[PDB]
Each structure stands twice: as structure tokens, then as C-alpha cells.
């Protein structure tokens, strides 16, 4: 069977408490106005005619919904193949408790739960159990006490809809529930209630099949007890598959989900998901996405596994002085900066240019590392713009520097009682220095009078002044070993990226790919372009890229927009009505179905603009109105024409 599923099934995205906000999350929700199955049930026969619908495939989620009573439906069977393969989640509801035993069960083709009479049992109902066959390897076995089937009891409980949403998204089987009565004489409510959170038993087994478990009073495998009330029964369980879609959920002051927008529906939903509101006004508003709904995210970040020897350029025998900085060029590495926080807590981790944290994602080309030691009084002079003693006549740093200077105290080994006279610095220079220079000159400086001809006499001295560190000095004079990391970004294949894992390269399908920091959403197809273009003349002020290079193999992939074409929605305000209009900028009223791909969209949009009441406009094809050959007043700017709309009627 097939019916219409009204707007219902919106759950809480995450567990973070929020209020009076509008968060547009991207999870596995139920598409509004979808086609759910009103699968009924029968009785009498146990072997073949036990029900009406066989096992249903579990793709991403199931929106369970039943309106029966007397506790008929008290179970939801989950599993991959359900036959001695993987752990089968068996959520069997009981009189007072609910068993969520995740164990290996051999579910037969006809799973039924015989009705057990209410007596004093051993805190469970294992007396009547013919749904499964065996159980050997039992995993986590949540035994939550509160009833899962029903919550409250009243006179409107007979029409109460016990709805449940299931999803095993990488670690947690998020279950939801909302036990609310329906108005008398209605199968599905016309409200916009939301399912409250529930148990989150952590599992990791994949689910590919779903089966609704029913109950029977007495079975005899005869047609006489098929539909009689006693020893028989019948029920219905609505099933709706969840697809990846974006939803804008409204929050109240008490932290509950209010009315939401499908955002994958009639173009008014895309108008709601581009203004982040719920009451739109009269105005031509553009839409970009949320109508193709990509399903998989490609990373393909690294190509190597060898860790980077950052410890080699961070803890050596003895770093050189300030006038000779050891530049160790590092390439073909893995940028794992997690070891930078769990080894000898430093003084100041000041990362300029880029954010101090979130460095394990942004990938660079080559990473340089310096190594010198200065006093504590000048640990801040090594920074973009800062001047002083070591920042005027020694190692410096440019204004634009997307690196991270890091220092730490070293009074332990870099200071002796007698005096560590090895470390020296330059203070006698004629002119200034330029960034990344190594002046190792050991000449004699003289600028006040005639040169001493290199004798170091009166008013003539050596530029290197031994500032030997002593343990009796204060924290301002203690030696500090400072490493100046330099992160370059050249137009070359990157060699040192973060520890991000790899994925599968999906072709000819809308995905969310982030190869080397180029976060872009688009269909990746194979192109005949010889080499990857490098747009640098116009700088691409209001334009994005069109092609990227795969970091694993040297293949040239082309970035094509999934569903676009310059779609501008015309809505005369949600306050007036819900009669939206669609405008496609740059079509010819014949290429519109192939432009926005009118083949894998929502059925509510396959009737709004395909070929009905089209009009050829200079900007494109305004589909959704009628070109009335009359005169009107100023309306929403479409580009041309003031023809029929929600005005005047």
C-alpha cells in the first residue's frame, strides 16, 4: 500500500541544549510529503500468511508509526542479513520493561510474539519467545526500565500515534519517540510535533534490513481464527525511509523543536533555507543548493603514511646561536601537530596568520623549521612587526608570515655556573637586515671614525657579544629555545598534509569533496583538459574554481555544479499564501528539465515547473504563472512582465 506522509518526523539533531535559535543541520531526516507504506497485517496462518509485507530494506532510517492498541506491535527487528552473520538489534517491548538485547539471533521468516498472560514473572517475559531461534554471542544489552511502546494512558490514547525514528550513524543507534494522541477520526495528524530524544545504546553493526514485529494471542494455523477478534488480530505500521536532507529547525525557550522546513521541496522551502527564516516577504530571492542533497563526503587527503620528524627539529643536542639559524627543510611529511601539545609544555604557542588550533586539516607544501636561542627578555621580539635587539640585527620575520613561532625555557642545560659563552648575538651592524638572512660575517665594525683596519682597538669591537646565561639570573635572563616554523603554500603538489583519512572517489555523483582544503560541493566528472588551469589574472573575485587535481592519482577532475542554472524563486510572502513561482535564468523553455536535472528531485517540484504554463523570457523561462496580456502595477522584479500572480485573487 501507499499513502501520503504529512510533515512529521523531525527529531533533535544533536544533544547540545539550544533555545531561540535557527540551526540548519544536515542529518538523515524524513522528506516531507513522501510516499510511506500503509502496510496492514493479517492473522490465522503462521507459515506463509502471517502478515502482508515481507522484510523491508533498511537504507538510512525508518519512520515507524502505528495506531493500534492492546499492545499488538511490541518489537522492531534490525540487522544486516539476520542469519548468523552480524549482531541483530531486537527491541522487544514488554508489559513494563523493554529488552534492547543486541545479540546474535536466528530470526525465522515468520517472526511472531505470543501474548503472555499478566502474572508475576522473573522480571522478564522470556516465557513466550518464538521470534528468534538461538543466541550465542550477545553484545551490549541495555535494559532500560521505562516502557517503549506506550508512555501515558487516557481516553484519547486509542488514537495515539507511537512514532519512532531509527538511525545507526557511525557509533550510536539514535532512537526517538513522541507519544501524542491524534484528533478523533484521523490516521495521521496535521500538526508539526517533534520526537523527543531517547536511548542511544552504542553499537557499530550495520543495518540493511528492517522488520516490524507483531504479536498474536493464540495461533492454530487455520482460516477459522483469521479475523474473529479472539485468537486473531490485525494492525498497521507506517514505514518511511530517511534520505540525507537539510532541515532548518526552530527552537523554543524550553529547548523543543518547533515548526521546521523541508528545504528539499517546493521552491518556497529553498527560499526558507537561503534566508534562514520562516516568514519570507515579497521579493526575488536566489537559491543555490539543498535540492540535490549530496550523500557522500570524499576526503582523499594524504598519499603517504610516514610521520614527520618534528621532534628532530624541536629537541636536539644543542641549538646554534642567533647569528646562525639552522634551517631544516622538511618535505614529503604528515602534518600531525598533536605531538606539539603533549611534549614539554611551552611558554607561548603564538600562531600568527592561521588559527592556533585546527592545524591538522589545513595542508601546506613545504614546512621550514628554524632553531636558535635567545634570552627571556626578547622572546616576544621574534614576531611580525616587533623590533628590538634580535629583531634588528639578527633573525627576523616578515609582515606576511603564515607560520607559528614557538619558544620554551631552557635554563636547565643552556646555562652553566661558570658560563655558557658559546651563544652570541650581533649588535654592531651598519645597516638593517632583511627577513630570512644569515649574516655570518666576523669582521670588525667601525662607524664613528676612521676604520681600525681590523684591530678591535679604541671604539672598535667585535659584533658578537657573548651573553652567557647564568643560573643565578631571573626568568627574564634565562635562555629560551625558540623554533620558528614556516608554512609555505606554492603552486605545486602538496607533500605534507594533516592526518585526515582517505575515502572512495565517487564519480558522476553529487558529493562533498575536500581534497587539499578545497572545500567544494559539485559533481566530479572526467574532463579532457590537459593541465589544471591556474586562475591568477582576475583573482576570481566573484568566481570559484572549475577543476581540481586528485592527491592520490594524477587525474584531472572537473567540478560541475550539481543542480543550478540561476534559479530565483518568486513568492508573494508566506503571510499571503503558499503559491510559489520559479524562474530559471539562462534557459530556453526546452532545456530546463536537463538544466536543474528534473529527474531525481522531489515529486512536489516535478509538477511545479516542467512544461506547464511556460513563457519565454529574455532572462530565461518564467514557469509558474500565466502571461496575461493586460496591464498591472509594480510587482516583484522578475526581469520583464507584470503578468498573473497571487495579486487580485
Amino acid at each position, epitope marked *: 500500500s501507499y499513502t501520503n506522509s504529512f510533515t512529521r518526523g523531525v527529531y533533535y539533531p544533536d544533544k547540545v541544549f539550544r533555545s531561540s535559535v535557527l540551526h540548519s543541520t544536515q542529518d538523515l531526516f524524513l522528506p516531507f510529503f513522501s510516499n510511506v507504506t500503509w502496510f496492514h497485517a493479517i492473522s490465522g496462518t503462521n507459515g506463509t500468511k502471517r502478515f502482508d509485507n515481507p522484510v523491508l530494506p533498511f537504507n538510512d532510517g525508518v519512520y515507524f508509526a502505528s495506531t493500534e492498541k492492546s499492545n499488538i506491535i511490541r518489537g522492531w527487528i534490525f540487522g544486516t542479513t539476520l542469519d548468523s552473520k552480524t549482531q541483530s538489534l531486537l527491541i522487544v517491548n514488554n508489559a513494563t520493561n523493554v529488552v534492547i538485547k543486541v545479540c546474535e539471533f536466528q530470526f525465522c521468516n515468520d517472526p511472531f510474539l505470543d501474548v503472555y498472560y499478566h502474572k508475576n514473572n522473573k522480571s522478564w517475559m522470556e516465557s513466550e519467545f518464538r521470534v528468534y531461534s538461538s543466541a550465542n554471542n550477545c553484545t551490549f544489552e541495555y535494559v532500560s526500565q521505562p516502557f517503549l511502546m506506550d508512555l501515558e494512558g487516557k481516553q484519547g490514547n486509542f488514537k495515539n500515534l507511537r512514532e519512532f525514528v531509527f538511525k545507526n550513524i557511525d557509533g550510536y543507534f539514535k532512537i526517538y519517540s513522541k507519544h501524542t494522541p491524534i484528533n478523533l477520526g484521523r490516521d495521521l495528524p496535521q500538526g508539526f510535533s517533534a520526537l523527543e530524544p531517547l536511548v542511544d545504546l552504542p553499537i557499530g553493526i550495520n543495518i540493511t534490513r528492517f522488520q516490524t514485529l507483531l504479536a498474536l494471542h493464540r495461533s492454530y494455523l487455520t482460516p477459522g481464527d483469521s479475523s474473529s477478534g479472539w485468537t486473531a488480530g490485525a494492525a498497521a505500521y507506517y514505514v518511511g525511509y530517511l534520505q540525507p536532507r537539510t532541515f532548518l529547525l526552530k527552537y523554543n525557550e524550553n529547548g523543543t523543536i518547533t515548526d521546521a522546513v523541508d528545504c528539499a521541496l517546493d521552491p518556497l522551502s529553498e527560499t526558507k533555507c537561503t534566508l534562514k527564516s520562516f516568514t519570507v516577504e515579497k521579493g526575488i530571492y536566489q537559491t543555490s543548493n539543498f535540492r540535490v542533497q549530496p550523500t557522500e563526503s570524499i576526503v582523499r587527503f594524504p598519499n603517504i603514511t610516514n610521520l614527520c620528524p618534528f621532534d628532530e627539529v624541536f629537541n636536539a643536542t644543542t641549538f646554534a646561536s642567533v647569528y646562525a639559524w639552522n634551517r631544516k*627543510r622538511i618535505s614529503n611529511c604528515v602534518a600531525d601537530y598533536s605531538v606539539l601539545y603533549n611534549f614539554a609544555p611551552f611558554f607561548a604557542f603564538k600562531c600568527y596568520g592561521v588559527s592556533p588550533t585546527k592545524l591538522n586539516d589545513l595542508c601546506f607544501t613545504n614546512v621550514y623549521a628554524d632553531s636558535f636561542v635567545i634570552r627571556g627578555n626578547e622572546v616576544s621580539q621574534i614576531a611580525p612587526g616587533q623590533t628590538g635587539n634580535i629583531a634588528d640585527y639578527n633573525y627576523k620575520l616578515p609582515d606576511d608570515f603564515t607560520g607559528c613561532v614557538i619558544a620554551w625555557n631552557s635554563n636547565k642545560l643552556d646555562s652553566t655556573v661558570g658560563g655558557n659563552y658559546n651563544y652570541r648575538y650581533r649588535l654592531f651592524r651598519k645597516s638593517k637586515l632583511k627577513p630570512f638572512e644569515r649574516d655570518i660575517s666576523t669582521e670588525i665594525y667601525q662607524a664613528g671614525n676612521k676604520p681600525c683596519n681590523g684591530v678591535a682597538g679604541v671604539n672598535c669591537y667585535f659584533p658578537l657579544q657573548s651573553y652567557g646565561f647564568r643560573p643565578t639570573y631571573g626568568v627574564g635572563h634565562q635562555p629560551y629555545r625558540v623554533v620558528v616554523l614556516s608554512f609555505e*603554500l606554492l603552486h605545486a603538489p602538496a607533500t605534507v598534509c594533516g592526518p585526515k583519512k582517505s575515502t572512495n572517489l565517487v564519480k558522476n555523483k553529487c558529493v562533498n569533496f575536500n581534497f587539499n582544503g578545497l572545500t567544494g560541493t559539485g559533481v566530479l566528472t572526467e574532463s579532457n583538459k590537459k593541465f589544471l588551469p*591556474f586562475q591568477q589574472f582576475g583573482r576570481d573575485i566573484a568566481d570559484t574554481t572549475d577543476a581540481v587535481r586528485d592527491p592520490q592519482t594524477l587525474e584531472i577532475l572537473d567540478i560541475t555544479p550539481c543542480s543550478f542554472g540561476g534559479v530565483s524563486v518568486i513568492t508573494p510572502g508566506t503571510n499571503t499564501s503558499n503559491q510559489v513561482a520559479v524562474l530559471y535564468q539562462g534557459v530556453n523553455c526546452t532545456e530546463v528539465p536537463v538544466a536543474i536535472h528534473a529527474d531525481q528531485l522531489t515529486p512536489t517540484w516535478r509538477v511545479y515547473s516542467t512544461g506547464s504554463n511556460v513563457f519565454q523570457t529574455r532572462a530565461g523561462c518564467l514557469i509558474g504563472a500565466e502571461y496575461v496580456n493586460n496591464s498591472y502595477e509594480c510587482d516583484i522584479p522578475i526581469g520583464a512582465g507584470i503578468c498573473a500572480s497571487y495579486q487580485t485573487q
Partner: nanobody
Amino acid sequence: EVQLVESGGGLVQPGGSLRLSCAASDFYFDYYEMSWVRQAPGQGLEWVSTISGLGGATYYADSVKGRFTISRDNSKNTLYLQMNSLRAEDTALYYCATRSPFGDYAFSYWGQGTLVTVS
């Protein structure tokens, strides 16, 4: 504000070689990495090879990997580009630009350019 005057070759024969030249006058920066950009008629512009300014590393492209060699010398403040084995595909107007290693991918010292064709 430095102008990168380019020279070295205007026309060559298929299967030959000719050294180019890119001299910078007011080039006080010693870390700005220099590179070459070729724009053939038809499709857009591509990348030939770059020279790291912080050190002395040189990175080449995939088509000109083992046929093009580069060299930099700050004493005379110029850039040289060799063109060994120009068989059939090295027909483009090569440009000499310069950008900082720390920043965006766009250049900041777009020069005039020089044409090199083999036919």
C-alpha cells in the same frame, strides 16, 4: 613596483633549446618565490616551475619535469630558464612573475612576457 623585463628567445626550431632571461631591477626581497607562467593560444595559462625563496629548492611541473631546468642567482638579480627538447608542445607565451610564499596563490609581479614557438 619592480618591473620584470623578459628576454632570451622569440622563435626556435622543433627539437632545440634556448635559454631565456628574467632580470629584476628593484628586487630587494630575497624570499619571494619566482616562477614561470606559459599561456598558449587557445586554452588558458599553465605553470612551468617555481623556485623556493626561503631555501634553494626547485619544483617543476609534470610535462616539463625532466626536460626543463631552472637556476637562480641573487648576485646579478636575474632568473634563467632552460628549454631543452622543445619537440611539439612548447608553443606558448611564457611570463615571469613573482609572489610571496606566505599568502594567496595569486602573483604580485606580473611581467611583460616573451613568446616561444617551435614549428
